[PDB]
Amino acid sequence: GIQMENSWTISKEYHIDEEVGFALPNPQENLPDFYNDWMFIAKHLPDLIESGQLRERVEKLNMLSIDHLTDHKSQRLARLVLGCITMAYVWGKGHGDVRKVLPRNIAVPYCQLSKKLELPPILVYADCVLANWKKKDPNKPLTYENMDVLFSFRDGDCSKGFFLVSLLVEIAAASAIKVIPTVFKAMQMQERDTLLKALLEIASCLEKALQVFHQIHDHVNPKAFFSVLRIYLSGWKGNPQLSDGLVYEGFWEDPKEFAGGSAGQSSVFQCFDVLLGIQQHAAQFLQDMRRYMPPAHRNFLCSLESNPSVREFVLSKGDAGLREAYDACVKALVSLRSYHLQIVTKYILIPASQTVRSTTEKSLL
């Protein structure tokens, strides 16, 4: 089911980089001069929100056409800019003074760009993480030390720690995604060792991805996350503060509901759920968040579901090494989901005070 570019590498239409996976490779940092007013607001979001200046600065913008964003990277950068501006405009300082209408000079170009990219007109994982990063030194490896985000909402919102640790988890998982064609090849060729080493490589990369996930505690403070950053990742779908949604002035007449951030927007959980056949109203929210992933990445997840099952192949072999390599992959994925629930508990549930994991742990044998 996976379309191949050649005998080794999956098709470029999936937009999956060998080094950074679902992340956008070498994101664009600067827009054309034509868009300098957008870039100024987005780069000054912290001080503009703090000073109460953001909303009126947005209301003074002129209408800028999207016709000059001529390539994928420039359009993804513009989506990140307009997306951050939009979140900052709707929520403001996050105290309760919300805006239920997005001015047209942002809404129209934002919604037109989102239409081109087939993404909802709201900030999504693919914006604020997958495309929101740069290398400090191009000649040095992808490390926290050597990386930075492009945009933040409030000084001290820990957006670098939160977004970059997430990104580095995605990059660790990239080293596992590149092995997927080897898994299916080894199954058609009945190559025991090739499949075994592929599965152990995937397990090793997902375990490294968990070790990267651990870094979150060193760069994100629970209070700052729950009280500040979480605000700007919140949406207008089932939100009592925007019960009917947001009016995109000049694009739709009626308000429209779009969901805020969710860990389900990372294609990593589903990619290896499907590969390992450890797939689970929650299925309705899972599929919905799939439509918040980049379209090419949805198509990769779907092509994966059309390949033969690795679980079945492995358990029919009477092959302890293959079963233990498969189990190491599932265990790695279950541990990532456990840690996501631990982070939800420490960074949302506890500060608020003051089942996917089960389906996956069931499919171990």
* Residue from 170, 236, 251, 325 binding ligand A1JGL (CB under 6 A): 170
- Hey, how many other C-beta atoms are within 10 angstroms of the C-beta on 194? 15
Contacts of ligand A1JGL in 305-324 (CB under 6 A)? none
Residue 65 identity? S
Q: Can you tell me the distance from the alpha carbon of 33 to that of 39, in angstroms, rounded to the nearest whole number?
A: 9
Contact 149, 133 (CB under 8 A): yes
Is the CB of 126 or the CB of 200 nearer to ligand A1JGL? 126
Return the SS3 of 134: strand
Q: Can you tell me the distance from the alpha carbon of 9 to that of 18, in angstroms, rounded to the nearest whole number?
A: 9
Structure tokens at 333: 């994925």
* Residue from 166, 175, 182, 360 binding ligand A1JGL (CB under 6 A): 166
Question: Which positions ≥6 away from 261 have C-beta within 8 Å?
Answer: 123, 124, 125, 128, 233, 234, 235
Q: Can you tell me the distance from the alpha carbon of 22 to that of 180, in angstroms, rounded to the nearest whole number?
A: 14
Is the CB of 293 or the CB of 322 nearer to ligand A1JGL? 293
Q: Can you tell me the distance from the alpha carbon of 346 to that of 222, in angstroms, rounded to the nearest whole number?
A: 7
Q: Which stretch binds ligand A1JGL (CB under 6 A): 30-38, 52-60, 102-110, 335-343?
A: 335-343
CB of 211 to ligand A1JGL, least distance (A): 12
Is the CB of 69 or the CB of 205 nearer to ligand A1JGL? 205
* Residue from 124, 130, 259, 329 binding ligand A1JGL (CB under 6 A): 124
Q: Can you tell me the distance from the alpha carbon of 270 to that of 359, in angstroms, rounded to the nearest whole number?
A: 13
Binding mask 204-233 for ligand A1JGL (x = CB under 6 A): ---------x--x-------------x--x
* Residue from 78, 90, 123, 356 binding ligand A1JGL (CB under 6 A): 123
* Residue from 80, 108, 128, 180 binding ligand A1JGL (CB under 6 A): 128
Nearest to 83 by CA among 45, 123, 55: 123
Q: Which stretch binds ligand A1JGL (CB under 6 A): 32-40, 45-53, 125-133, 182-190?
A: 125-133
Consult the annotation and say whether 340 binds a ligand. yes
Q: Can you tell me the distance from the alpha carbon of 320 to that of 23, in angstroms, rounded to the nearest whole number?
A: 35
Contacts of ligand A1JGL in 241-300 (CB under 6 A)? 261-263, 265-266, 268
Binding site for ligand A1JGL (CB under 6 A): 123-125, 128-129, 166, 169-170, 213, 216, 230, 233, 261-263, 265-266, 268, 336, 340, 343-344
Annotated binding residues for heme b, written as ranges, equal 340
